[PDB]
């Protein structure tokens, strides 16, 4: 049923300097459909020499593009956005195919939320003041230059858009390494910016492994900035690789986001949305609220409510419109999550529902059972470590002060959730969570809100004007207007 | 004549948690007067265990201080500023003693410019909006937490102030490692914040080597951010040491700042100020304009003008009010500069004036001759490498387009200078220099202008509101106001 077909002519090519060119190496990367475990396509595996050709194209194109007026850059970006909306069905099918997102999920969110980043960067150029005059001193905001972008597989198009749209809008030039576990939609996206009219060399695509291609980028002497969305392990290696060239380093990494239900919350109506939030994209989301923090005298009620809403999630074939969750995105991730579930069992957590093993009736495919643990201690492995699968922890508290301490009891700080009837109280608690975003009573997504981590969830912000400013340098021209006397 | 006396009771102590405490190790660091080459004092050498006590104090004090109202924090900072102004003569004598700054220079700039950073952070709290409401989403700016500050010896008090004032104002808590080659003025500064009323643990001082104390800070699991002003070599090592904890990393590093004289400039009145600018603080300044870029058909005139103004700089005893330049700050730096001068001779540059050797008549003390090279090629070592002594390069150009290419022909981008009669033209050139600051026709210093590097001159900005925001996280509270329907 899945309708995506990889272009045979460009599958094992790179997009460099306005054209698809042969890779310098013959190594291939097979792409596996997580729903069937079959290789559905191959893509090329870049070398450092390929990353060289791409950086050279980006460098050569930077003067022309940064010299293009904001209004005109905004026109190209606008057109890119139209093309995403036009080819959205094609894009939803490739995302689903490569990382198993329920086709329903791919149409409703995987693509449209990505479109939104592009829209926001377009509208943004209409008002942004690149120069400001404070007296005799003028502040000019300029593109930082050639940028390395590395993205993960869980929200593949969306994570490419959060980086490319602002980078391009700022006047930067960009070389992107997509996840080798979700390369197909990136292939469509490169074709899309080509068709949208982006000058050769402004956007460049190279496929390959993190350590080889990503490593080359992090160390390249001609790259002015690198932005990575991925694991902490990879984030730190790129930071270390980038230090001697003193690049600007932007990192969006792991999380263990808390969901505090305050005592005055409507538990029957708030536990189900939290569970659904924790298990969105089958838990494959860094900001997912996977630690639900609730009053002890209410734990047995929320346990029942969590098993109840978990048990009604339809897990199955992503090709069906009524499937809610597809499989874990790939074999490596499947086995990691499975290990985390078994670790929780072995450390004595209560298995409210779910458990290990493939989902019954989908033995082929990385289908993982939606899992809920309760009576969870903050010291447990499943409470401290990001699992990146559908595994929700229930944690009890005896005071609101205690609930905040548990929420902050983590090396991470990417996001957080608060449920409460008294809005004043809920706000004061939110301002006490050390996290880049706190969400009150399940607000809807906001494409202008800065997104990023405190502590070990990263460095920098994406989305909206904040994300746009990550790609600008800052210049002071003192004596811009001569002084008096 | 120098009147500073180190407090014998606190010289080999650390300022931790509101008191002077014994170091955990008995290692001492001798402090040498560069003007006489005599050890004038000793200070303690911290261990990782000392950095632990200091981080613990900072952590423990962070809740109280961040919970103190901006208005009240601004009052403490205001008082710190009064005390700097009151004890300025004592502070100028300690700076001069430890790193050889001409006493005249220490009174006029070394201290007052440092006072200014403190003033700017005080006034700033009066207007800064820590919360903003964009609809149903609120942006709250919060202190990032415990901060490691590492500073150099060339502008010792001033570099401590650019970091501590904004950090404290933001609500952060701070542990500072001063340069072990300029520890005496830091000792007075710690006493000063104590007397000013800063709560125990908000500011902590530990002395010691970069690799040992600085290394401990860069790697500490409880430090949320580290800011370093120093060499590229040290900047990258701290970045690498900090990567696995994902700290915020702020770096102010080397420079090779160009000074372009455009053809319409008044060469007789512009060459002398450039030379004086290059040799301020005897060249011991990262942003100093040490590459003077001038029209070829004008080189012989600027050469003569540079020798002329160089030859009239009074180099001698910093204890004399009429001394203009003191010695290089310390023996290590003296020998480094001397090697750079000899390298320039050996690579065929023209020695317009200056040369190697101690300044005649000051054989005792690290007195270095003000040196000017001309007919300098961009590929020369003396053109590519920061020298950090009084060594000015003269470079010729045949077009304004060429002059810009030479100015940007550098791994650095900390600052830059433009001389020109047509202000429109001079502005357009300034916007073409890839540098954090460009200064037109020798404007006066601006404590609100963002200061920092493009490319390899660092990451982040100091001074004014920009520097203040380096110590704030960014939080989005989505659903702050419930939505319609
Ligand atoms: N904060 C955010 O906005 C955000 C958003 C989505 C996902 N994430 C996080 O991403 C993770 C999921 O992705 P993953 O674990 O598969 O990512 P990962 O860290 O394993 O890989 C991410 C990217 O880095 C590349 N890479 C791997 N090793 C590299 C190396 N040493 N040098 C350079 N590049 C290298 C990979 O090829 C990939 O493109 C989760 O932790 C999730 O929370 C964060
Ligand atoms: N950009 C700016 O605002 C600015 C301002 C002033 C000076 N500087 C630069 O500073 C340099 C002058 O200072 P320097 O060369 O003596 O500095 P340096 O790099 O040798 O030392 C700077 C600081 O780092 C510490 N340190 C040394 N090694 C360390 C390590 N491995 N880990 C942690 N800390 C370590 C030192 O003890 C000192 O406190 C020049 O390059 C100058 O341009 C920059
Ligand atoms: C409504 C959720 C939007 C998707 C957020 C994905 C970012 C986290 O990995
Ligand atoms: C007027 C010069 C102010 C001092 C600038 C010092 C910063 C560079 O090291």
d(CA B172, nearest CA chain A) in Å: 14
- CA dist B23 and B30 (Å) reads 15
CB atoms within 10 A of CB B118: 26
> SS3 for B374?
strand
For chain A, the maximum distance between any two Cα atoms, rounded to a whole number of angstroms, is 85
- CA dist B391 and B19 (Å) reads 43
Enter the tokens of residue B352. 């317009």
Enter the tokens of residue B58. 């900072």
> SS3 for B335?
helix
| Angle at CA of residue B375, ends B369 and B377, nearest 5° | 105
For chain B, the maximum distance between any two Cα atoms, rounded to a whole number of angstroms, is 85
A202: closest CA among A15, A52, A9, A48? A15
> SS3 for B285?
coil
- CA dist A162 and A159 (Å) reads 5
Q: What are the φ/ψ torsions at residue B405 (nearest 5 degrees)?
A: -60, -40
Helix (H) or strand (E) holding B58: helix B48-66
Q: Is B64 in the pocket of ligand 2 (CB under 6 A)?
A: no
- CA dist A173 and A66 (Å) reads 8
What letters, b where the CB count within 10 A reaches 16 and e where it falls short, cover A68-84?
Answer: bebeebbbbbbbbbebb
Q: Report the nearest-CA residue for atom 2 of ligand 4.
A: B445
A421: closest CA among A264, A226, A219? A264
A147: closest CA among A62, A49, A81, A79? A62
Per domain, the residue ranges of chain A are: 1-254+447-485, 255-446
- CA dist B377 and B395 (Å) reads 7
Helix (H) or strand (E) holding B237: helix B232-242
In the sheet where A173-177 sits, what is the strand order? A19-21, A14-16, A203-205, A173-177, A146-150, A225-229, A248-252, A458-459
- CA dist B222 and A49 (Å) reads 40
Enter the tokens of residue A153. 């597989």
The 3-state secondary structure of chain A reads CCCCCCCCCCCCCEEECCEEECCCCCCEEEEEECCCCEEEEEEECCCHHHHHHHHHHHHHHHHHHHCCCHHHHHHHHHHHHHHHHHCHHHHHHHHHHHHCCCHHHHHHHHCHHHHHHHHHHHHHCCCCCCEEECCCCEEEEEECCEEEEECCCCCHHHHHHHHHHHHHHCCCEEEEECCCCCHHHHHHHHHHHHHHCCCCCCEEECCCCHHHHHHHHHHCCCCCEEEEECCHHHHHHHHHHHHHHCCEEEEECCCCCEEEECCCCCHHHHHHHHHHHHHHHHHCCCCCCCEEEEEHHHHHHHHHHHHHHHHCCCECCCCCCCCCECCCCCHHHHHHHHHHHHHHHHCCCEEEECCCCECCCCCCCCCECCEEEECCCCCCHHHHCCCCCCEEEEEEECCHHHHHHHHHCCCCCCCCEEECCCHHHHHHHHCCCCCCEEEECCCCCCCCCCECCCHHHEECCECHHHHHHCCEEEEEEECCCCCCC
Q: Report the nearest-CA residue for atom 21 of ligand 2.
A: B230
Which CA distances in Å does A402 have to A396, A433, A450, B63? Answer: 9, 12, 28, 16
DSSP B9-57: TTTT-EEETTEEE--SS--EEEEEETTTTEEEEEEE---HHHHHHHHHH
Please state the atom number of ligand 3 nearest to the C-alpha of residue A287: 8
Enter the tokens of residue A343. 């670790």
The 3-state secondary structure of B400-441 reads HHHHHHHHHCCCCCCCCEEECCCHHHHHHHHCCCCCCEEEEC
> SS3 for B305?
helix
- CA dist A118 and A159 (Å) reads 11
Helix (H) or strand (E) holding B274: helix B267-279
Q: Is B449 in the pocket of ligand 4 (CB under 6 A)?
A: no
Q: What are the φ/ψ torsions at residue A140 (nearest 5 degrees)?
A: -115, 130
Decide if B375 contacts B350 (C-beta within 8 A). Answer: yes
Where residue A473 falls (left for φ over 0; alpha for ψ -120 to 50; beta otherwise) is beta
- CA dist B354 and B341 (Å) reads 9
Decide if A171 contacts A178 (C-beta within 8 A). Answer: no
- CA dist A170 and A62 (Å) reads 11
- CA dist B19 and B158 (Å) reads 23
Decide if B292 contacts B276 (C-beta within 8 A). Answer: no
Q: Report the DSSP pairing between strands A437-440 and A417-419.
A: parallel
> SS3 for B225?
strand
- Identity of the residue in A440, A449, A482 whose CB atom sits nearest the CB atom of B441: A482
What's chain A's length in residues? 485
Q: Is B29 in the pocket of ligand 2 (CB under 6 A)?
A: no
Burial class (CB in 10 A: 0-12, 13-18, 19+), B264: exposed
B332: closest CA among B11, B99, B42, B96? B99
- Identity of the residue in A142, A431, A478 whose CB atom sits nearest the CB atom of B140: A431
- CA dist A124 and A117 (Å) reads 11
- CA dist A282 and A157 (Å) reads 17
B231: closest CA among B379, B333, B373? B333
Q: Report the DSSP pairing between strands A458-459 and B28-33.
A: unpaired
- CA dist B282 and B287 (Å) reads 13
Q: How many CA atoms lie within 13 A of B397 on its CB side?
A: 21
Which CA distances in Å does A318 have to A35, A76, A215, A262, A444? Answer: 7, 33, 34, 36, 24
CB spacing of A450 vs B235 below 8 angstroms = no
CB atoms within 10 A of CB A485: 3
Decide if A91 contacts A113 (C-beta within 8 A). Answer: no
d(CA B86, nearest CA chain A) in Å: 30
Question: Whose structure tokens read 């409510």?
Answer: A305
Resolution in A for the shown PDB structure? Answer: 2.5
Mutate to test the pocket of ligand 2, among B117, B159, B177, B210 (most ligand atoms within 8 A of CB): B210
- Rg, C-alpha atoms of chain B: 23
- Structure determination technique employed: X-ray
- CA dist A188 and A442 (Å) reads 33
């Amino acid at each position: 049923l899945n309708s995506h077909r990889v272009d045979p002519h460009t599958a094992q090519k790179f997009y460099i300097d306005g054209h698809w060119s042969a890779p310098l190496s013959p190594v291939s990367i097979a792409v596996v459909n997580p729903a069937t475990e079959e290789v559905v396509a191959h893509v090329a595996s870049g070398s450092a020499a390929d990353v060289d050709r791409a950086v050279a194209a980006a460098r050569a194109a930077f003067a022309g593009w940064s010299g293009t007026s904001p209004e005109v850059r905004a026109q190209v970006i606008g057109r890119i956005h139209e093309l995403i909306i036009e080819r959205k069905e094609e894009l939803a099918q490739a995302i689903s195919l490569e990382m198993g997102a329920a086709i329903s999920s791919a149409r409703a969110m995987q693509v449209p939320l990505a479109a939104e980043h592009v829209r926001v960067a377009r509208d943004l150029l209409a008002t942004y003041r690149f120069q400001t005059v404070e007296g005799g001193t003028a502040i000019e905001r300029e593109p930082i230059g050639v940028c390395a972008l590395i993205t993960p597989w869980n929200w593949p198009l969306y994570q490419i858009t959060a980086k490319v749209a602002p980078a391009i809008a700022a006047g930067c030039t960009v070389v992107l390494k997509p996840s080798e576990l979700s390369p197909l939609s990136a292939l469509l996206f490169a074709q899309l910016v080509h068709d949208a009219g982006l000058p050769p060399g402004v956007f460049n695509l190279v496929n390959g492994s993190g350590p080889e291609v990503g490593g080359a980028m992090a160390a390249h002497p001609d790259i002015d900035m690198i932005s990575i969305t991925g694991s902490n392990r990879a984030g730190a290696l790129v930071a270390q690789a980038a230090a001697p060239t003193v690049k600007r380093v932007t990192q969006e990494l792991g999380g263990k986001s808390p969901n505090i239900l305050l005592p005055d919350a409507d538990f029957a109506n708030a536990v189900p949305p939290g569970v659904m939030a924790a298990f969105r994209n089958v838990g494959q989301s860094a900001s997912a609220p996977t630690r639900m923090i609730v009053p002890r005298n209410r734990l047995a009620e929320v346990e029942a409510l969590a098993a109840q809403t978990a048990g009604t999630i339809v897990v199955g074939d992503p090709q069906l419109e009524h499937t809610v969750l597809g499989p874990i995105a790939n074999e490596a991730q499947f086995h990691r999550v499975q290990a985390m579930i078994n670790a929780g069992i072995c450390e004595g957590a209560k298995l409210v529902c779910g458990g290990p093993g493939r989902v019954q009736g989908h033995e082929q495919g990385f289908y993982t059972r939606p899992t809920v643990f309760s009576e969870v201690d903050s010291s447990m492995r499943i409470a401290r470590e990001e699992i990146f699968g559908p595994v929700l922890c229930l944690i009890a508290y005896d005071t609101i002060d205690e609930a905040v301490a548990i929420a902050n009891d983590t090396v991470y700080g990417l996001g957080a959730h608060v449920q409460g009837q008294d809005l004043e109280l809920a706000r004061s608690v939110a301002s006490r969570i050390r996290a880049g975003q706190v969400h009150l009573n399940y607000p809807s997504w906001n494409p202008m809100a800065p997104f990023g981590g405190y502590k070990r969830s990263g460095n920098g912000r994406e989305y909206g004007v904040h994300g746009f400013e990550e790609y600008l340098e800052t210049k002071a021209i003192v004596g811009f207007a001569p002084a008096d006397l």
